[PDB]
Ligand binder design. Structure first.
Ligand SMILES: [Ca+2]
Ligand SMILES: [Ca+2]
Ligand SMILES: [Ca+2]
Length: 250
């Protein structure tokens, strides 16, 4: 596995020469499994991960500020799973474009500031601010898991979108969304279509629903406070919500 360091200096990039890693004008492209540690400010770019469905990568955000004037700061085209680690004590900021440009205009992905076609896990005790101006904040077509982090999401559309599922087991999470705070869609795959919150401190301000899930919502051992225009929890399936967990944002 690779263990590479990438340092941004506004309009310069200093990267280890390693297998499968390339740097182009507005792109850092990862094609081999391993760990990739990012730091510094990048004026305009995308971290593109395309390593195959049988391989994993860790992106360590070690004090990075990435803006992308055309698209998503992080786009995972393929992976078994990508873990995004928020380094302790570091401030990370990701800012995407108001309107995405799709080089092939028949594409409509990526459609979130952090977008993945595959499982994504966010972890660590560091800080992350996601400024999502186009559509969703953190999105995946499969499973989103957050196990830690001081995470702030500002999204034009949905805050966290995990088509398969969304799991939050830790972290201090602050979501502002123009649609749903947390949204899940999958109707078919066994034991998907759920939102499972088992820890953390969560604040959701949503114009529509705080949590919009298809088959299940479970909340326990967590502090979830919401202020919404729609429902605190919208779910066609089952609700298993421990008392004293879900309340009003003051
Ligand atoms: Ca997939
Ligand atoms: Ca999965
Ligand atoms: Ca909704």
């Amino acid at each position: 596995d690779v263990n590479a360091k990438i340092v941004f200096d506004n309009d310069k990039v200093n990267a280890d020469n390693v297998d499968g890693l390339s740097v182009s004008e507005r792109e850092v492209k990862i094609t081999k499994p391993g760990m990739y540690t990012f730091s510094g400010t990048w004026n305009d770019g995308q971290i593109l991960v395309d390593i195959g469905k049988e391989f994993e990568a860790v992106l360590v955000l070690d004090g990075v500020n990435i803006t992308n004037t055309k698209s998503a700061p992080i786009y995972i085209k393929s992976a078994e799973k990508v873990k995004i680690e928020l380094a302790d004590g570091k401030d990370n900021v990701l800012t995407d474009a108001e309107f995405y440009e799709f080089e092939d205009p028949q594409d409509n992905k990526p459609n979130a500031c952090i977008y993945s076609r595959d499982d994504i896990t966010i972890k660590g005790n560091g800080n992350l601010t996601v400024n999502a101006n186009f559509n969703n904040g953190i999105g995946t077509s499969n499973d989103l898991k957050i196990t830690g982090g001081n995470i702030t999401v500002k999204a034009f559309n949905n805050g966290l979108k995990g088509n398969g599922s969304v799991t939050i087991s830790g972290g201090n999470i602050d979501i502002t969304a123009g649609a749903d705070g947390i949204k899940v869609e999958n109707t078919e795959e066994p034991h998907k279509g759920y939102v499972n919150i088992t820890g953390g401190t969560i604040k959701i301000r949503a114009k529509d629903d705080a949590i919009d899930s298809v088959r299940s919502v479970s909340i326990n051992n967590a502090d979830v406070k919401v202020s919404v225009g729609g429902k605190d929890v919208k779910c066609e399936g089952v609700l298993n919500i421990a008392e004293g967990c879900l309340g009003k944002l003051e």
